[PDB]
């Protein structure tokens, strides 16, 4: 299949200049264009410009012209986007997206890449096991939880059983509290799968290289 695998999340300081990538696979790189769209605040999409791997001609959204910079790497089949002098408004999700040459309708999209443009010091989070009150009663199912308090910036990844526990879950969007973040999750299995089977919420944090596995323990 056609797949766009883009660079990870970025934290940089105002005036700094990040460079995001986008590995294309499963189709002939050159024969298509690489378009980049930005989605600020989970809101409005915005096209930054594009490139033709082949002829190497680039078009720029009239406003990102001054600071976006598109390039292609045919050998790797990799598209890039450096946004010089980042201001605090650059902070958005960047998506590389493919499109033909005169039909600027977007075909396949990258997964996104969070780009926070800030001052604030990276803050790793504090993860805490959440265990059912106190009983080990019936109810035929039990809900366990995981709270990830205080971090910076926003891109955080919580899994449960390293994604082996795909369903029954509910991770919840984070909320900004005094320049830091508080995100949490919920997992509901059967009164027979817990406490016996071990469940482990696991949080990652790019910005501070953080790997936290917190095992949920009864009381």
């Amino acid at each position: 299949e056609v797949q766009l695998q883009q660079s990870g999340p970025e934290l940089e300081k105002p005036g700094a200049s990040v460079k995001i990538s986008c590995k294309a696979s499963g189709y002939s790189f050159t024969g298509y264009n690489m378009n980049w769209v930005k989605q600020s605040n989970g809101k409005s999409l915005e096209w930054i410009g594009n490139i033709d791997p082949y002829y190497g001609g680039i078009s720029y959204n009239q406003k990102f012209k001054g600071r976006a910079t598109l390039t292609v790497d045919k050998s790797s089949s990799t598209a890039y986007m450096q946004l010089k002098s980042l201001t605090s408004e650059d902070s958005a999700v960047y998506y590389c997206a493919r499109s033909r040459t005169d039909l600027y309708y977007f075909d396949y999209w990258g997964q996104g890449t969070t780009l926070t443009v800030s001052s604030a010091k990276t803050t790793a989070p504090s993860v805490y096991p959440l265990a059912p009150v106190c009983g080990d009663t019936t109810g035929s199912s039990v809900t366990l939880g995981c709270l990830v308090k205080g971090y910076f910036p926003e891109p955080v990844t919580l899994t449960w059983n390293s994604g082996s526990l795909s369903s029954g879950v509910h991770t919840f969007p984070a909320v900004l509290q005094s320049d830091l973040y508080t995100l949490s999750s919920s997992v509901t299995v059967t009164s027979s799968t817990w406490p016996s089977q071990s469940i482990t919420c696991n949080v990652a944090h790019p910005a501070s290289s953080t790997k936290v596995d917190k095992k949920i323990e009864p009381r």
Binding site: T30, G31, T101, D102, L103
Partner: protein
């Protein structure tokens, strides 16, 4: 190369037939026009074929088309010295505003060359 053509230079005695080949990778390009270009002048359409058709004729000029196989060819049934020029293969995405052009073949007619 979204649209590709071969050969890139064919030299042929006058009277002879010429076969110019071409193929595209993007399945739903729908119009396939070929073009002729005489030294010092703007490219001039020669013959064309919608995608829903296997053959196309104009006296000496003829396209044979392979939708399924994404293949197309140009046969210049009788060659005369007047046919020497560059023939670009071409294709258009349905709803499109442009022509995506092959690299063109340089056909030469009646050689011992230098025409």
């Amino acid at each position: 190369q979204q649209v590709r053509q071969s050969p890139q230079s064919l030299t042929v005695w006058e009277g002879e037939t010429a076969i110019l080949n071409c193929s595209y990778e993007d399945s739903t390009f729908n119009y396939f026009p070929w073009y002729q270009q005489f030294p010092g002048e703007g490219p001039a359409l020669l013959i064309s074929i919608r995608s829903v058709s296997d053959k196309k004729e104009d006296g000496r000029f003829t396209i044979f088309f392979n939708k399924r196989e994404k293949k197309l060819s140009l046969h210049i049934t009788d060659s005369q010295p007047g046919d020497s020029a560059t023939y670009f293969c071409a294709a258009r995405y349905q709803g499109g505003r442009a022509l995506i052009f092959g690299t063109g073949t340089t056909v030469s007619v009646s050689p011992g060359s230098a025409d």
